[PDB]
Amino acid sequence: AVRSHAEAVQVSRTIDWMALFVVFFVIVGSYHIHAMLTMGDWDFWSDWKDRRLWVTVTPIVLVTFPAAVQSYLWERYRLPWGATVCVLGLLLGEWINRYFNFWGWTYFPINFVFPASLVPGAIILDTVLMLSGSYLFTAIVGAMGWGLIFYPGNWPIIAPLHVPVEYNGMLMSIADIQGYNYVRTGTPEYIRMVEKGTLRTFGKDVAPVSAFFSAFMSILIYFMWHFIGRWFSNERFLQST
C-alpha cells in the first residue's frame, strides 16, 4: 500500500504533474490537427486574416475541443480551465512552429505569419462556466462571448497592418503588401476566401454581423461538442473487441 499521509500527498502531486503533462500534450496534438485541417489556412497569413471569413469561421471550428475538455474536466474534478489548457497548447504549438519552421526552415516574417489570439475567449468560456455552473448557461453566454470577443481581441495586433498605402497606383493594406511581397508558392491570391464585397452588405456592418453569426454557430457547436465530450468521457468495459 502507501506508507503515510505526507508521502501519499507527494505521490498525488507527482501524479498531478504527470497527468497535466499527458493531457496537455495530447490536447495539443489533437486540437492542433483539428485547427490545421479546419481553419489553418486563415491563421497562416496576415493578408488571409480578413474580417468576414476569418472572423466567421475561426470560432466555429475552434470551440470544438474546448467544449469537450471543459465538459469532462469540470464534471470530473471541478477544474475550470479546460478551454484555457486547450488554447494555450494550440498557441504554444503554433508559435513553436512559426518560429522554428515558418521562420527557421523558410524565412516568412513573424509579423506576416503570426497566429491568432484566443486566450480572452478561453478565459471568458472558463469563467462563465465555473460561475453559474449551469452548462446551458455556459453554452449560451460564454459561447457568445467567445464568438464576439475574437475579432476585438485580435484588433490590437492586426490594427497596425491595416494602414492604407498607395502601392504603384493601387490602394493596398500593409497585410496586402506583405502578402504581395513575400511569395507563397502553394497559396496564391485567388484561394483567399476573404471579403470580396456583396450587393447585400449594408453600411459598416461586415465585422459585427459576422461576429454575431459566429457567436450563434459557436453556441450550436459547443452544445454538440459538450455531448461528444460526455461520451469521450465514458469508462465502458467492453469484453470482446
Binding site: 480551465w81 503570426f114 490590437p156 490594427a159 492604407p164 504603384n168 493594406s173 500593409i174 511581397n181 511569395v183
Partner: protein, 382 residues
C-alpha cells in the same frame, strides 16, 4: 521543381512561355532582378482544369528568397487575381528583389482557380551577401516609412506574450492546490461543493472583468493610434489587355506524331504552307519548357537555361528555305536528353496522349512568325 511530376500532356498544352529574358544572373542583396516574357494560353484547354477565369501571376522559388516587388500583365499592375481568356497572348514582367543569399531556381509559375499550380521554365539565379543587409521599406498614406521586415513584430510579440502570461497565471492559480485525484474523490464521494468557494468566485469575476476591460481599452487604443484603417483589398481584375499578335502567314497541319518507347526523340510529319512574300525556315519547336533549336537556322541568345535548351536537338529532313506560295511535306525529329530528364516520355502513363507546342519560323530578314500545332501523340514500340 514541382514539375517533372505534373501530367505530361497537361504541361504540354496548358500555357506556353516564350520570349523569356532574365535581367541578371547573379545579384547581391537589395538588388532587383526582372523577368520578362510572354505566355500564351492554349486554345485546347484541358477539361479537367477549370478555365483561367480567376488566375494569379506567381513566382516559383524555394521560399521568399526573392520578394516580388512588382508584377504586370500587359502594362498594368496585377497584385490580385486576374482573368485570362482562352487562346489570347499576354506579356508579363515581374520585378524581384534579392532577400536570401544562395543559389535559387526561380520559376515563373501560373496559378488557376481550379487547377492548382502551373510551373513554367526556371533559371538558376545566384545571390551573394547576407540576410541582415536586406531592407523592405514602404511609405504609407499616413505619412510614415516602416520596414516590413520587422514592422509590428514587437507589438505582436508583446500582445501574444501578455495573453499567454494571463492564461498561464490562470492555470497556475487553479493548479497550486492538488489537482486530479483528491478532487476527483471529493466530487465522486458525495457533493464536493468545497473545491469552488470564495474567494475563488471573486477572483474569477476579477479575471473575467479584467479580460473584458483590457480587451476594451486595447481596442480603443488601437482605434486611437492608427486612426485611419482600411479593410483588406481583394477582388479579381477583369479586362486584361492581350497582345495584338499579327495573323501568322504560315499554316502548319500535323500528319501524326510518334515517339520511341523508351527514347528521347519526338518524330512528327508537317505540311508547311507559306503565304506572304518571304522565304521562311523552321528554327524552333517549343513543346513544354524545352526548346528544340536548329543551329543552322536560329541560335538562342537570351541566356535560356542549358538543361532546357536543345542547341541542335531539332533535326529537319528538308530544312531548305520555303518559297512563298510553295507547300511541302517534311519530317521533323526533336531528340534531346531533356525529353527524358523532365519525364516528357511518361505520357504513355498518362490517360490523354496529346501534345501542343509552338513553332518559330525565321526568314532571311531575321524576323520570326509564331505558329501553334497540336495532334495526337502515338507511341511506338517495335
Amino acid at each position: 521543381h514541382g514539375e517533372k511530376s505534373q501530367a505530361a500532356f497537361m504541361r504540354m498544352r496548358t500555357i506556353h512561355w516564350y520570349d523569356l529574358s532574365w535581367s541578371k544572373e547573379k545579384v547581391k542583396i537589395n538588388e532587383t532582378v526582372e523577368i520578362k516574357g510572354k505566355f500564351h494560353v492554349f486554345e485546347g484547354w484541358p477539361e479537367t482544369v477549370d478555365e483561367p477565369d480567376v488566375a494569379f501571376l506567381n513566382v516559383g522559388m524555394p521560399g521568399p528568397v526573392f520578394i516580388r516587388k512588382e508584377s504586370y500583365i500587359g502594362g498594368q499592375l496585377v497584385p490580385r487575381s486576374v482573368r485570362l481568356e482562352i487562346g489570347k497572348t499576354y506579356d508579363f514582367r515581374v520585378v524581384l528583389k534579392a532577400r536570401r543569399p544562395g543559389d535559387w531556381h526561380v520559376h515563373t509559375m501560373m496559378n488557376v482557380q481550379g487547377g492548382g499550380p502551373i510551373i513554367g521554365p526556371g533559371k538558376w539565379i545566384t545571390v551573394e551577401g547576407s540576410m541582415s543587409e536586406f531592407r523592405n521599406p514602404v511609405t504609407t498614406l499616413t505619412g510614415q516609412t516602416v520596414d516590413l521586415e520587422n514592422y509590428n513584430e514587437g507589438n505582436t510579440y508583446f500582445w501574444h506574450a501578455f495573453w499567454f502570461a494571463i492564461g498561464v497565471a490562470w492555470i497556475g492559480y487553479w493548479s497550486r492546490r492538488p489537482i486530479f485525484i483528491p478532487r476527483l474523490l471529493m466530487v465522486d464521494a458525495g457533493r464536493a461543493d468545497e473545491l469552488v468557494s470564495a474567494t475563488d468566485r471573486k477572483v474569477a469575476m476579477g479575471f473575467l472583468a479584467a479580460t473584458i476591460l483590457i480587451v476594451v481599452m486595447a481596442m480603443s487604443s488601437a482605434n486611437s493610434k492608427y486612426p485611419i484603417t482600411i479593410p483588406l483589398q481583394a477582388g479579381t481584375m477583369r479586362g486584361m489587355k492581350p497582345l495584338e499578335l499579327p495573323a501568322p502567314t504560315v499554316s502548319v497541319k500535323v500528319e501524326d506524331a510518334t515517339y520511341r518507347v523508351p527514347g528521347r526523340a519526338m518524330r512528327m510529319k508537317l505540311t508547311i504552307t507559306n503565304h506572304g512574300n518571304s522565304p521562311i525556315r523552321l528554327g524552333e519547336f517549343y513543346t513544354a519548357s524545352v526548346r528544340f533549336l536548329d543551329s543552322d537556322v536560329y541560335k538562342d541568345t537570351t541566356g535560356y537555361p542549358e538543361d532546357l535548351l536543345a542547341e541542335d536537338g531539332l533535326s529537319v529532313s528538308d530544312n531548305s528555305p520555303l518559297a512563298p506560295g510553295e507547300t511541302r511535306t517534311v519530317d521533323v525529329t526533336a531528340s534531346d536528353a531533356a525529353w527524358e530528364v523532365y519525364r516528357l516520355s511518361d505520357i504513355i502513363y498518362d490517360p490523354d496522349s496529346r501534345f501542343a507546342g509552338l513553332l518559330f519560323f525565321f526568314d532571311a530578314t531575321g524576323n520570326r512568325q509564331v505558329v501553334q500545332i497540336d495532334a495526337p501523340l502515338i507511341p511506338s514500340f517495335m
